[PDB]
Amino acid sequence: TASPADTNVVPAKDAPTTNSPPSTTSPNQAAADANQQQAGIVSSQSGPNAVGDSAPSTSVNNDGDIITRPTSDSIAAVANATKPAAVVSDPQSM
Amino acid sequence: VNDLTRRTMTGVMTAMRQVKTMTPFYIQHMCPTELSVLASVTVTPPFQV
DSSP states (O other): OOOGGGTOOOOOTTGGGTTOOSOSSSHHHHHHHHHHHHTTOOHHHHGGGGSSOOOOOTTBOTTSOBOSSOHHHHHHHHHHTOOOOSSOOOSOOO | OOHHHHHHHHHHHHHHHHSOOSHHHHHHHTHHHHHHHHTTTSSSOOOOO
């Protein structure tokens, strides 16, 4: 009778962007389409509402850039690109 | 639409109009009571404009 599943419905974790497919071309439109198809709506019934919409995607950075890996790794990548040797061997060292 | 079809359509439409239904009564007099009650038990309260 008093089914909790019908009373305690709340958005799941990572809800706003979970369905976003991994792509770089048009992530927001692609994510929007994925949400629409995931929700069970078919394009033939949504009509004109499906053409211009866009939704948040994981491929888009908070700054508004196309990202292909977690931002920490991007930070790690640039950091690792610059690591001069701590101790070097040269004849004139005192 | 010849005459026979015209009457047939008219008969069908008036048939739809004449049949009794409780749905309008339920909506005007009963449904709001249920909605008000249900609005206080869900975790997510109603969001309206």
